[PDB]
Amino acid sequence: FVIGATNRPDQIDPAILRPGRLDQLIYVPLPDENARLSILNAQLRKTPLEPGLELTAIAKATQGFSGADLLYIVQRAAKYAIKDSIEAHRQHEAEDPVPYITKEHFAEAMKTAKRSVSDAELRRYEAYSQQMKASRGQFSNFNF
Amino acid sequence: VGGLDEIKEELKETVEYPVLHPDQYTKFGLSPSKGVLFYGPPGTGKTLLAKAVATEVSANFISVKGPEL
Amino acid sequence: KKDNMLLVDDAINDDNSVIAINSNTMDKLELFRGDTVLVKGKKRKDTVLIVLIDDELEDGACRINRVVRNNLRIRLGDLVTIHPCPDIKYATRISVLPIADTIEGITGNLFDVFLKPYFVEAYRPVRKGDHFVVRGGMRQVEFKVVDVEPEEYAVVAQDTIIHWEGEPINREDEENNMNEVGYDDIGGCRKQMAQIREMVELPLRHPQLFKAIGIKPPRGVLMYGPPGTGKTLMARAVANETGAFFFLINGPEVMSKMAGESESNLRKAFEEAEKNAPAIIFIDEIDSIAPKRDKTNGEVERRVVSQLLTLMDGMKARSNVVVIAATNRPNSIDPALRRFGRFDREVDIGIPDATGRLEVLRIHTKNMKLADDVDLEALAAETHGYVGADIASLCSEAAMQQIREKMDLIDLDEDEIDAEVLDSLGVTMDNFRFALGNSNPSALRETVVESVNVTWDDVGGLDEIKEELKETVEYPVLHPDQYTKFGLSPSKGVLFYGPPGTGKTLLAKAVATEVSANFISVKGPELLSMWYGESESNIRDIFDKARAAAPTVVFLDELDSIAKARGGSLGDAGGASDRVVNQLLTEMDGMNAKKNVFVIGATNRPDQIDPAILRPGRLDQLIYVPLPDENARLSILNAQLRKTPLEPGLELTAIAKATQGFSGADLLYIVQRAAKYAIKDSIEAHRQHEAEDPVPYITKEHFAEAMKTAKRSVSDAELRRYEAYSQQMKASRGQFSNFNF
Amino acid sequence: LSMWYGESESNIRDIFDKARAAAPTVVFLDELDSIAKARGGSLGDAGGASDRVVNQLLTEMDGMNAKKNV
Amino acid sequence: EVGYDDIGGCRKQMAQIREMVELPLRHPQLFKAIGIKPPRGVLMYGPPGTGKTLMARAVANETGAFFFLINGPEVMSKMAGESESNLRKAFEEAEKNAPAIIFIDEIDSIAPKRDKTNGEVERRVVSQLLTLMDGMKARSNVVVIAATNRPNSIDPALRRFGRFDREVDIGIPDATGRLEVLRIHTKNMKLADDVDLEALAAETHGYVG
Amino acid sequence: RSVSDAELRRYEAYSQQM
């Protein structure tokens, strides 16, 4: 069972994409609003979170984002929480304060967050997918 | 691996079918499918799907980089 | 906790053969004032002494004089097991000898003077190997019990025959006896130590568990890992404490010039190890007698491999013997030799942790008179990528630095050194700090960065960039507990892009001077070669060396050079830049462990960079370092003029306000032109004053004549391109707002 | 310049190490029209080698070195 | 015969080598009072023509310890099992007689880093060196000294503590070092009375050794 | 489908040449 994971299917030889060697050409698209919520739930599985915090606004605000961008948002929120915790520790030593990630950490982490892929590469991937679907021409309900 | 439900289920069944039920495959008289290729935008879950295949599926895993060999 | 083990305490009773227990210890374990008890301490040594009720002792630890304490190889604050032995009985004869340096000067009857009154009517309980002390005649002599007739230990009743001889020795033998390496010197690899010690010790102490379970224990150890980790020390401790027969085999030691002699030597070695006793065979450096049987071209190597494979597992293979191997690379070994029965359990003695380095520091600094103010926790926390064998080099360098400091002020006295300075030497903390600043890990000795001297206060302006870089560098280094409590991986990558002459390389140098992590730096095309795949091998080796001695930070300079996007050439150059890009994308985020790999990238052309490497997980922080404003211009003018004499009436506000389009390199050019004009004026004034310090600082006139040829570096088109790229990166942040919940 | 992949950058690194090794030396970089060429983009192997030798000059003239006397 | 006063101009590396050569052999009382064994490995690298062989000759002629000289490729042979035997014979001859000093000149010819070459004999020689320099009862009162022109073509297991721990950098001298070299080499030639050496040392810049 | 359209053009050109 060979598995290929290539981020550019143009430079592949056309004799390897032939069935019998690599027949399952699975296109992994960008996540939508129902998949970004599950990605944010899976990435925040082993962390303490605020009971009033929801990820629906984070899934609805970002529309062209990716899992790496959501992981970057989560890591920036965790870095801001660690900075606030070490600031509270330094103030307590001068004179557990942060038990979970609050909403202000996410609101400050979602200010310097951008998408990874641009619009031209997404158009190139949709063009390759439509070329592969044009290779699936003359297909219908297929009554016998 | 958040999301990718149909891709995850199809990859998982394509791996686990000929290693658990070979009797139906020799009853139908056909060889199973072997390869699978993931392609798309970078940072989407291809290597994460490969790690999820490597960590818990009963088949032995041989990992190799591109220009490593 | 069985109350039969006690700690060593200072001695009240100054007698040699005695230990003091407390009365609440006597009822807790039945013993008496005359009872002779066997003390067994560390390093597999023993001694015999008289127990005596001591009120001050306090039941938990025992008082023993420095002589007993020495024979057991223990210190004040070490644990020992105590247990009584009345099986011992009065001696038939004894064999004591004076240590040479304790009798240099005198001669004659040592028996009548020292030994006779020392043993008389005390019937002391001595032991073989003991070194006792007798004070008399204005000196203290040290004898060592060399032999007794009634086994290892016996008593010296008046009828016992004391034999002393006079050919005394230098204490080379005493030093060797003290050194024997003990199991408690390889601290730092607990799981690998237990995995070796289990199959070494359990089928030798009691085999009833294996006789009841029916199965046979594994008889093969393969210790692989980085060089300088403790595999030879583990084999030496196994050879030194385990009482079975030992046989060490070097790698190219059996090889002989005769046809068929190396295999005969291996057969004779295995038959000698099997003939005597159930033994342990340590074959060191097995990469020279096992070249995988396929890549080699000779015949003697293949026959040695076949001899090992037949003699290790075949017909009547091994009768209760265990083989241990040690190697620096596990991959160049035959897979038939990496099989069960021959070499089955492969322990991985790898790079230690903070507590492992603290254990190595506490082990290596337990015999020296160190200090009263040196802590080892900060030394173990600031040491990051040491392989475990460089800690002894650190302590040796600190001791040599202290000795070199003590040798220069006070005179050396080359005929004979005065012994007053030997009692007060110590090892201070600044010696350890200088030894830490003047050393490196043994794996990163080939990619050492040259000693640049900059400071975080020498990089003016860019306060948000500096604090963000300091946060990104020093949060997973100083606080791993918060990151493992939140259960998330820290951000590692950062990219610097902007106009040239701004401070990206200066920020990289300020990182390379004073961060709490190791530094590995490369140039742009520096890791490229002319062969096929050698650039890939260089990339893989430098990333394995960066992730091995973690945490390190990698400065990938000129990402435009080392990484194109993909396939940009119409005619390819062999298809190598795409492979370099693919290997970079795989090593920065692939199927690895990702312990600590910080990637710093500084480029001045962000258009030719791969979007797959501009993606989070490899390089997420796209830090844009812009041109300085008025306040940043004033701070870089104050920072570039940090160490210089200046006029007190000098005002840099007009210089900061008049340029308004300059950069750090152009202001450095202005400062250098002013310094060159001041140097020319000083040379002219000195020549005038020597023909028939003239200037002690730089005046305003020098800056006024140096600011006549000042010109900007960047044009108005490259700045347009950089601001267009920044506006496109801000337009990638679309469909966003203040985001109030 | 050379035919192989990286030999021109190796020659640049070698001549700059020879310059900064026995310092002070002075280097006469002739024909910067031939060496630098102001990279831009040309979509070719000559443009790739020009970008590589320009970035090697950028990392050798002002890079992470001692910059004693060049 | 050359002495310690003929390598003028590299006094820092001279002191760094002279410490570990003289102080553990002259009086070991400080090392026995501190309870720390001294380092036993020298690796003199740098540009070709700096004075490493002259330093080896100086520490050979000055100290009263035994000096066994081992060249780079002189231990090699054609038979299988002879170069390792020559290295073992050299090490036992240096260990049996006295506390001695070994000078392995040109170690880059018997250390091909065990990864870029396909010959088994070179790997066997490197394994013999790694075993003889750090193993069971490895070194007793002996010390090895290396000298090579390139410092990167050596095995990292050979560039380790216990084998080669003090890698001194005998580099190019400054103007005072050129002044000392000009004053040392012109001590046996009656040249003139109206000649100076300060301007001769300050004129040149790239003259090494 | 397995093969693209340009590969068939190349194979037809080679079959017309040979």
Ligand SMILES: Nc1ncnc2c1ncn2[C@@H]1O[C@H](COP(=O)(O)OP(=O)(O)O)[C@@H](O)[C@H]1O
């Ligand atoms: N669908 C996803 N669910 C959860 N995490 C994800 C997902 N996609 C990406 N990530 C996170 O971002 C990283 C990048 O994904 P990865 O598979 O390595 O990218 P690629 O497809 O380029 O090989 C993952 O390792 C993971 O940490």
Ligand SMILES: Nc1ncnc2c1ncn2[C@@H]1O[C@H](COP(=O)(O)OP(=O)(O)O)[C@@H](O)[C@H]1O
């Ligand atoms: N984990 C460790 N604990 C204690 N000492 C160590 C450790 N690792 C290395 N050392 C020390 O490093 C020195 C050389 O190590 P050694 O065992 O001879 O080399 P290697 O690990 O290559 O087999 C010795 O002084 C040894 O005590």
Ligand SMILES: Nc1ncnc2c1ncn2[C@@H]1O[C@H](COP(=O)(O)OP(=O)(O)O)[C@@H](O)[C@H]1O
């Ligand atoms: N922002 C700055 N702050 C302080 N000094 C600077 C700054 N920018 C440039 N300099 C000075 O000019 C030199 C050139 O900067 P450097 O980092 O080497 O170049 P670059 O900006 O191309 O990466 C620095 O070494 C320093 O002496």
Ligand SMILES: Nc1ncnc2c1ncn2[C@@H]1O[C@H](COP(=O)(O)OP(=O)(O)O)[C@@H](O)[C@H]1O
């Ligand atoms: N630093 C130096 N000081 C004094 N003489 C030197 C120095 N370097 C070289 N020489 C002289 O140069 C000659 C060759 O130097 P040598 O020590 O053999 O160097 P190498 O073996 O590295 O080529 C000798 O005659 C030596 O006296």
Ligand code: BEF
């Ligand atoms: F496309 Be991913 F970065 F492997």
Ligand code: BEF
């Ligand atoms: F013997 Be060690 F691993 F160099």
Ligand code: BEF
């Ligand atoms: F490194 Be600089 F931007 F020239």
Ligand code: BEF
């Ligand atoms: F030429 Be020498 F060995 F540096």
Ligand SMILES: [Mg+2]
């Ligand atoms: Mg991947």
Ligand SMILES: [Mg+2]
């Ligand atoms: Mg070893």
Ligand SMILES: [Mg+2]
């Ligand atoms: Mg730079």
Ligand SMILES: [Mg+2]
């Ligand atoms: Mg020489």
